[PDB]
From a paper:
Carbonic anhydrase IV (Car4) is a newly identified receptor that allows adeno-associated virus (AAV) 9P31 to cross the blood-brain barrier and achieve efficient infection in the central nervous system (CNS) in mouse models. Among the generated AAV9 variants with higher efficiency for infecting the CNS, the variant AAV9P31, which includes an additional sequence (WPTSYDA) inserted between Q588 and A589 of the wt AAV9 VP3 VR-VIII, exhibited efficient CNS tropism with 385-fold higher EGFP expression in the mouse CNS and 1000-fold higher EGFP expression in the mouse spinal cord compared to wt AAV9. Car4 is localized on the luminal surface of brain endothelial cells throughout the cortex and cerebellum, and its sequence and structure are conserved in Mus musculus and Homo sapiens. Here we report the cryo-EM structures of AAV9P31 and its complex with Mus musculus Car4 at atomic resolution by utilizing the block-based reconstruction (BBR) method.
Residue numbers in the entry:
A (entry chain R): 22 to 277
B (entry chain A), C (entry chain B), D (entry chain C): 219 to 588, 588A, 588B, 588C, 588D, 588E, 588F, 588G, ...
Write the structure that this text describes.
């Protein structure tokens, strides 16, 4: 119901991450520390084939209160990797903090990043099954404060329009490729069976998280926290919408 | 017959028969020998390198042919005007043609003293492709038609055709045609030729513009008995899901139920006449809309009939969606806009989509909430339609015709076609006016005194001239409009000019200052 | 007999024959004066001054018109049941319209006291636009029709029309129509009016649902003599390619060869009647699917006929792809879902694609190994088809008609159209039943004793009432099905109900509980 | 009658007339009992709960049926050669079917001795669905046709059909048909049956290939009087936009204006017979191109008629856009390319788009400059068209037919269709030849001596044989081409071989070594 930062006032009595309902109290959750020493290389892991990631079109951007989610529509499927059949992009949200020290979702060798971006792909057809492997989300790390990339520029421009929670706007025009690292860098990643980073966790996600973070200007990162708020009144910002790390358990993380 | 006797008497006049009008035109037509007297294999190679998209192969025939597939070959400016200021529709019903007063002459450039003398005993071979057995090139908007100004003398174009080509090479399927493999009439100076033809039934051309728009046909005073989704969220915030419905009425015509929709489309790049707001880039070909065939792309030149631009967008024109004519005296290559006349089809904006805009938008996903997994929270996403094919309930107008534009075209002989109105404008016919081929007869001239199996070559220089006469019957569609206020009419402008529009100048040169359409009268949808 | 005798009887009935059914209906109407006897120009600036999408320009007339373009104006619920449970097809053939028992009244309402007397003189003018020279507003699903319940007395709606507009302004092409420029009959008490109309050749409406699906027409016991690609890379995993083929048969119906494919489509957004799985955002218009005309956008209201939803997904409906009727007494602005009745078209799911689903998939590149060319390689990629036009071999069904839905529509007078069946349902005709215009003749009050000059604006306050009868003969297409098992039929429910469906309540208010289609019987594809 | 008397003669031959040819075929068939004389419900589950895409519901009947919907059932290879080498077109006109020399058998399968004898008093049932009241399964390219070899004896296939289904379940709309609910003739050894049928009017099949291309219809020597945009920028530098126009002439045929365009398309994935350049991935179904119906996906099989490959790339073929036949002896599952014969349609490249290429390119934006809001300055952007629906001005050819391909198909009974030429080739007909159903009348075995209610389940084992004859008159379209050079003709190859093509081997096995189309002769567009 609520992040740990939100449950800091005497009022606004909601359930923090330590008391999240549903199936979020189990072994596999999602946010784990990825030690590169203990991971084993899987030869079958190959870079994904990004079809429809080069098209430019308007995207719906809205203040989901807990984060900013961008609807990816159709025609942005993924067929590469070791995914069962193929997955189609449906949503794009991200998590950040007030500085590149607190962290964002996943950590590599105990190292966190300024911002974490979650591109979630739903299973294309499958069937009416309750089985796992229903979502194949791509995780990208973001931590840099030097140079501005035009890929994230329309997103930052659209950020002020959704300042209040439950507000809707639209990105002017951009492509998914521009917001991703160069294809020459998208070669190494990790796969682990996590459930969900949001409450009512369901163990149906592949969680292919990439190394080699993306670089955005520090001004854009500051605007992310400055232009967003949790409550209806512009009092509490959206700094720390990050779930605390969870035990790895007996799950084994593979490396490409 | 006989030299001392003509075979024709100048016939040019036009007679309006109320619901009809007969056009008559006569003209002189000089014809040369052409490619000596031989057929010549031609090809991309022959032309040169052309291009993959310009690759070809066919033959240059030594024959020539007559042509009048242009309204101006039959209607005078005054004639047109009237037609267009007084009828909703019009169409050809027949044609009668005649060649006469033919004179064949031989030229003798006596060491620099070219001397023309009459060869009273020579002939021109003429025939029609009535059974349509030869490649039909009369539907390609080429030059070589009877000039619009009767006093002008004409040269008669040369007949040539194309077949299948692999690059510059031919294939076994390729065909060769010999026009001498056809029966033909031989005419001496005392002889003449004539034939008549019946136009197959064709739809009247729409010489009008609609006074209503497809999206504005409802009663502006009465509500519809239908409802539309007005809201999806209460608003305030947080789980606001709701379904509100409202009656569609005069206040919101946009959301009202409709029975018919606009015609199909194939987006074209927009181009501004003001070359400052365009784009500093060479995009003529790169930004052109095109189609491919057997690995060969061809520009969507006329393309589907689509409104040239939105109300007030005048300065804009689809990269390749309009007919562009050259003004009198205009050069052949890289001429400025001020040298050409670009047509437009604004009139059809009432039913046809704008050529430089998307047809519309379509849903591309299933909007949803986090109702299942917290994912699936997808917002309604839509996409733009750049090209829209035919849909039931669609309606549309065809491209207008012009005085200086083409009249008819031959529908390709295929298993299937749809709405075969020629895309450049006019009337499409499976059996249109047949091609009338004409070529003099090569004089064998000097032969050797000892047998020569080698075919002859020296042939005596000659050329031929005479008169052609085409008459076309056009049925007319009258108007019974109840419109109160005066209609829009095409008129010349009184304002003191240097030269009358559509006339000759001090040098005796004719000039069609502007293209003239046919859509001035108005009628309801 | 004048002022003492009747100009007519009530009639209003139904006669069913073997292959025919003539319906008769008579109702009581009242006509006000409208526009104070005058014509007035109307525009969005005059009324709303709304956005460009809803801009308009037109005219309001002092005339009224008769409307009976809905099935319930002629068919009783029972009549309707008999029709739909016993006939595979139907269509209108002829019509008899008549007016009578005209009564014109004046209104005193003086110094407070309001009184009513009859003006035995006075006149009502009546004329039909049999020549179709006036804008046709009967195909826009408007209110103002003959009440479904015969005992209801109704008021004639006011006639108004729209012409061309640029914003709220008019253009030179816009047309002003004056109804007094049309010949008309004037009628005193004792005079009656009558006219007959013959319906054009229209196809029978499909009052059936298919018992088979386009993708299931093959014999389930026999294989095909055709093969399909089954495997491609002998599994393994290095550099192994292969082409394995297999016979298409009962086990893999999905890949069998087929001769016909489903009809065209134009994707619509999906909305759930259970407001929780929808999406917490306003998308009614944002994601509505639409088309554009001269810079103006119009929704895809009942656009192409598509299956409303996948089998068992009734909770879902296309945003603007279905007809939505209002229940008795429902408001006009922002009403709840329980106050309206959303129709569906699941019966056509056997041949038409689902309205909220992509038509299919299509290849978008060339799959190749790396060696081809160099070290590029490529995997087979496909893309979704959101809007698909018309292709040869397509088959589809048209929109169903409803007891409360429209009957006919006027096909727009354009050069070309495809399958001109109205998208809201019914029969499309080039010359549908002519509009019937009606008006009370103005009666000046008392003029000055000195010649003025200007038009009279002082008039006696009057209104008219009378009876109207309409009779329509409908042709029927019977069924000769060999189906062994019983069929689905429209039936009332026996369960106790405070009120009887399709009847008046304790206050005498007639209501139609639900929409009734026509597709209950079944036949093979 | 009865035994001792022949009921019919053989009759197997062809008769060629000027514009007609009558084929006559006679064959020997055998007919078992089938479902032990029972009707049975079948379904995906029944079989083995197949995929959603492969789910079905239907019934299996103890009836058999006659299938001769293939060209090799009537035309000998020799005869086929004369048909395609001398006629530009052809079509079926009328037919006569005959069943004769019945003869059934008892087969007393005692212990090991199956002992077969004749049951003279046994009956066979036969009836034609001339009213088309039964599911039509003859348009699904199933096996069970009259053998091409007039000497091969064949078994009648069993009749089965499918109705509506929800997964493996039926719905109330589903229909059940009992064939015994139809009047049927009963025949003993001395009885015969015959019926005649007239084919509805169908277009002649195009048994020719075009000698011209849609993009090469112009005179290669004459310029057009239309201009095209040649340049947009004077050169490099910066702010230097311009508009230069040029005459479209022979040297730049690619940009010439044209009246007609290529037919529609639905892109298919390209596959190479060279399994080294395709891919190291399984993409048969992933990248196959398909269409959806009520949530079920069906492969776009032959689909729209599109050229199989670009002139030259014969190694390529559309994933599922061509007809694939199995060679003699070829198995049914995962067979190699060497075991199958893949057809192609290169002949239609003259008018139809290439199956594995985009239809063309379309604009997607408005090129703009650094005007107010210089940060804008757009750039001409275009997009590929993978699926193009019908547009006015389109022309196309239909898929070719083959000696081993189907002849006709039943057009689905619907409100609408477009160009209903069966996608697999042939003639589409609303009332095609009626299905001929046949069944061994059950002969109960010894009943009990005390009355029992249960239906009988013990029956004398029986099977029937006999002869069948079918005669079809075909109308021919003679050619009067003026092409000089010889044409391409289908011909056998003289080079020596172990066997004769289209004959039997040392084991008496007959075989068709290759598919034979009909497009050898040529004609202009
Ligand atoms: Zn997340």
């Amino acid at each position: 119901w609520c992040y740990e930062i939100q449950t800091k006032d005497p009022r606004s009595s909601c359930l923090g991450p330590e008391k999240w309902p549903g199936a979020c109290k189990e072994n596999q959750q999602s946010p784990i520390n990825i030690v590169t020493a203990r991971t084993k290389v899987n030869p079958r892991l190959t870079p994904f084939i990004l079809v429809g990631y080069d098209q430019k079109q308007q995207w719906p951007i809205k203040n989901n209160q807990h984060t900013v989610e961008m609807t990816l529509g159709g025609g942005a499927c993924i067929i590469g990797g070791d995914l069962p059949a193929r997955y189609e992009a449906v949503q794009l949200h991200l998590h950040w903090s007030n500085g590149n020290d607190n962290g964002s979702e996943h950590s590599i060798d105990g190292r966190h990043f300024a911002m974490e971006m979650h591109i979630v792909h739903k299973k294309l057809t499958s069937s009416k099954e309750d089985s796992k492997d229903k979502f194949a989300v791509l995780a990208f790390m973001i931590e840099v404060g030097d140079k501005v990339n035009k890929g994230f520029q329309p997103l930052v421009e659209a950020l002020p329009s959704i300042s209040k929670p439950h507000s809707t706007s639209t990105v002017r025009e951009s492509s998914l490729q521009d917001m991703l690292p160069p294809s020459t860098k998208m070669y190494t990643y990790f796969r682990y069976n996590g459930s969900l980073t949001t409450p009512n966790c369901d163990e149906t996600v592949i969680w292919t998280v990439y190394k080699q973070p993306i670089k955005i200007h520090k001004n854009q990162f500051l605007e992310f926290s400055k232009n967003l708020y949790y409550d209806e009144d512009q009092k509490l910002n959206m700094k720390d919408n990050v779930r605390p790390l969870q035990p790895l358990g007996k799950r084994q993380v593979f490396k490409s | 017959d006989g030299v001392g006797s003509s075979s024709g008497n100048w016939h040019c006049d036009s007679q309006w028969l109320g619901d009809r009008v007969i056009t008559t035109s006569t003209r002189t037509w000089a014809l040369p020998t052409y490619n000596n007297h031989l057929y010549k294999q031609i090809s991309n190679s022959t032309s040169g390198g052309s291009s993959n998209d310009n690759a070809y192969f066919g033959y240059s025939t030594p024959w020539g042919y007559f042509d009048f597939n242009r309204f101006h070959c039959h209607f005078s400016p005054r004639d047109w005007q009237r037609l267009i200021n007084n009828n909703w529709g019009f169409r050809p019903k027949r044609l009668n043609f005649k060649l006469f007063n033919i004179q064949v002459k031989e030229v003798t450039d006596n060491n620099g003293v070219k001397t023309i003398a009459n060869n009273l005993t020579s002939t021109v071979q003429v025939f029609t492709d009535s059974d349509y057995q030869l490649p039909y090139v009369l539907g390609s908007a080429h030059e070589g038609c009877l000039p619009p100004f009767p006093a002008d003398v004409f040269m008669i174009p040369q007949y040539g055709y194309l077949t299948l080509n692999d690059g510059s090479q031919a294939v076994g399927r390729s065909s060769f045609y010999c026009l001498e493999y056809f029966p033909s009439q031989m005419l001496r100076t005392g002889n003449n030729f004539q034939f008549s033809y019946e136009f197959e039934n064709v739809p009247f051309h729409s010489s009008y513009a609609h006074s209503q728009s497809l999206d504005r046909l409802m009663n502006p005073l009465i509500d519809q008995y239908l409802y539309y989704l007005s809201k999806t969220i209460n608003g305030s915030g947080q789980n606001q899901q709701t379904l509100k419905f409202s009656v569609a009425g005069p206040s919101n015509m946009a959301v009202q139920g409709r029975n018919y929709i606009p015609g199909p489309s194939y987006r074209q790049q927009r181009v501004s006449t003001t070359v400052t707001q365009n784009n500093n880039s060479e995009f003529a070909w790169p930004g052109a809309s095109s189609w491919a065939l057997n690995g060969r792309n061809s520009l969507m030149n006329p393309g589907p009939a689509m409104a040239s631009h939105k109300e007030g967008e005048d300065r804009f024109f689809p990269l390749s969606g309009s007919l562009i004519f050259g003004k009198q005296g205009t050069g052949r290559d890289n001429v400025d806009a001020d040298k050409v006349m670009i047509t437009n089809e604004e009139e059809i904006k009432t039913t046809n989509p704008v050529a430089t805009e998307s047809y519309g938008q379509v849903a591309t996903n299933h909007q949803s909430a986090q109702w299942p997994t917290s994912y699936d929270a997808a917002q309604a996403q839509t996409g733009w339609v750049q090209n829209q094919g035919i849909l039931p309930g669609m309606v549309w107008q065809d491209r207008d015709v012009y005085l200086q534009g083409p009249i008819w075209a031959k529908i390709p002989h295929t298993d299937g076609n749809f709405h075969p109105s020629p895309l450049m404008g006019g009337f499409g016919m499976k059996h249109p006016p047949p091609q009338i081929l004409i070529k003099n007869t090569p004089v064998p001239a000097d032969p050797p005194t000892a047998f020569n199996k080698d075919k002859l070559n020296s042939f005596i220089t000659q050329y031929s001239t005479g008169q052609v006469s085409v008459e076309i019957e056009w049925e007319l569609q009258k108007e019974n409009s109840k419109r109160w206020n005066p209609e829009i009419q095409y008129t010349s402008n009184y304002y003191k000019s240097n030269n009358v529009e559509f006339a000759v100048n001090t040098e005796g040169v004719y000039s069609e200052p502007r293209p003239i359409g046919t859509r001035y009268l108005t009628r309801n949808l």
